[PDB]
Design a protein around this ligand. Structure first.
Ligand SMILES: C[C@H](CS)C(=O)N1CCC(C(=O)O)CC1
Ligand SMILES: [Zn+2]
Ligand SMILES: [Zn+2]
Length: 229
């Protein structure tokens, strides 16, 4: 189930969807896993999130070449922290078009990240403005509101039961919300609930720092973010 490829782990979640996992030692926390997604859409591949580093992100591209062997048409990254955007330069070196929330691109320099090439913007109801996410295929991008960070976005995969909450959602048995230093403590709980309502039929909830879980991850995250207000 978990395919080891160098220092990374890959897990198939659906016929056209894989989870990528990479690790970084955070002095004081251990070797922290971060998950993203790889989606085959016909003759091309779409990536959600980089790995922590450029070298690890180049290894994701090597795994794609070996296991799928189709071009990577684009990548979308889900907020301006290192586990999601740390490997942007590796995507750009490979010629891959990159997308992030306009606010993630604004924050990227001060957070120590390289910005994506393209900015997503969002309607008042949270759905991406379609002209900013051209050729996204089955990826449905949703801004649920500020939570884990002000810029966090989420992604559903059409044709599957999968929705990706990134670092906004923790699993059913998590004991805390993790890194809160950039969090919007007032709005976190509402944002987690908005993610769940945006993808009401997703039964497999993928997230950055836990293995895929049921919809119980969303309400546990929400039932827990209430504590920060
Ligand atoms: C560098 C990342 C950006 S989200 C971070 O701050 N982490 C890693 C995940 C960890 C957790 O919540 O398990 C909280 C500390
Ligand atoms: Zn984060
Ligand atoms: Zn994270």
């Amino acid at each position: 189930g978990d395919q080891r490829f160098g220092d990374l782990v890959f897990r198939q979640l659906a016929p056209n969807v894989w989870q990528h996992t990479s690790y970084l030692d955070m002095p004081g926390f251990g070797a922290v896993a971060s998950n993203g997604l790889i989606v085959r859409d016909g003759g091309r591949v779409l990536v959600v999130d980089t790995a922590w580093t450029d070298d690890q992100t180049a290894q994701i591209l090597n795994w794609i070449k070996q296991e799928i062997n189709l071009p990577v048409a684009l990548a979308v990254v889900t907020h301006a922290h290192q586990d999601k955007m740390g490997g942007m330069d590796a995507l750009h070196a490979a010629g891959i078009a990159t997308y992030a929330n306009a606010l993630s691109n604004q924050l990227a320099p001060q957070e120590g990240m390289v910005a994506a090439q393209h900015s997503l913007t969002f309607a008042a109801n949270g759905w991406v403005e379609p002209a900013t996410a051209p050729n996204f295929g089955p990826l449905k991008v949703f801004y649920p509101g500020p939570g884990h960070t002000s810029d966090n976005i989420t992604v559903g995969i059409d044709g599957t039961d999968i929705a990706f909450g990134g670092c906004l959602i923790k699993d059913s048995k998590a004991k805390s919300l993790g890194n809160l230093g950039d969090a919007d403590t007032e709005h976190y709980a509402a944002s987690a609930r908005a993610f769940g309502a945006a993808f009401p039929k997703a039964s497999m909830i993928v997230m950055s720092h836990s293995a895929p879980d049921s919809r119980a991850a969303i309400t546990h995250t929400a039932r827990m973010a209430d504590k920060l207000r």
